């Protein structure tokens, strides 16, 4: 695999520093500061190594969780006053082909968005993913069985978010067929 070039290359400058230290979580995999085993040396890992490595994957977790909450929320909140602004243009043409031209680029940008925050949440889950599944295999230390459903765990913001972005689908349909 090529993931460490692969995050790197696939950066955008509005999540530029929330990233996955990816190459700084495989350096520390390095870092081993046990006994010296041999191999036809390189130190072994321990419970104070494996203490250092949590420590820091957890700081690297709870730094993309805080960028997906705060990016996440700014579309819902796009979305709230795009479909007020969509509902009386719907309203008033029932009771102008600039004022759905306008909506439609306004609308557009926000599924743009969605897309780009989807992407940042697969590169990085992809991430994490990857890094826990080198620890086990370099190591011998199994991180996997508690960090899989901690990534997997949902937070409050998401199912709200979800409806929001099954809606922006539908406000968008709406704005380019009238
Ligand atoms: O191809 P690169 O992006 O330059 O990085 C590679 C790659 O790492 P990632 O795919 O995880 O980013 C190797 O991983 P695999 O091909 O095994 O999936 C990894 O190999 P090992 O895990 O077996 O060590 C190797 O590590 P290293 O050379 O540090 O031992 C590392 O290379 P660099 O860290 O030197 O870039």
Redo the contacts with the bound molecule.
């Keep these: ?6 995050l790197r290359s696939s950066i955008i400058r509005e999540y530029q520093w929330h990233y996955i230290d ?2 700084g979580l ?1 350096a520390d995999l ?1 870092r081993a500061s046990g006994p010296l085993v041999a191999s036809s040396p390189r130190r072994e890992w321990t419970e104070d190594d494996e203490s250092r490595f949590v420590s820091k994957l957890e700081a690297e977790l709870d730094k993309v969780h805080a960028k997906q909450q705060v990016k996440a929320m700014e579309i819902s909140r796009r979305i709230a006053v795009s479909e007020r602004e969509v509902q009386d243009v719907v309203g008033r043409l029932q009771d102008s082909e600039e004022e759905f031209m306008l909506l439609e680029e306004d609308l557009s940008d926000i599924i743009a968005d969605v897309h780009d925050l989807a992407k940042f949440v697969q590169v990085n889950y992809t991430g994490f993913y ?2 826990i599944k ?1 620890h086990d ?2 190591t011998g230390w199994r991180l996997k069985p508690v960090f899989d459903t901690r990534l997997k765990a949902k937070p409050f913001y998401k199912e709200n978010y979800d409806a929001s972005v099954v809606r922006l689908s539908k406000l968008y349909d709406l704005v380019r067929t009238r």
């Design positions: 695999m090529k993931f460490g070039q692969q990816y190459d495989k390095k990857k890094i080198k295999k370099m």
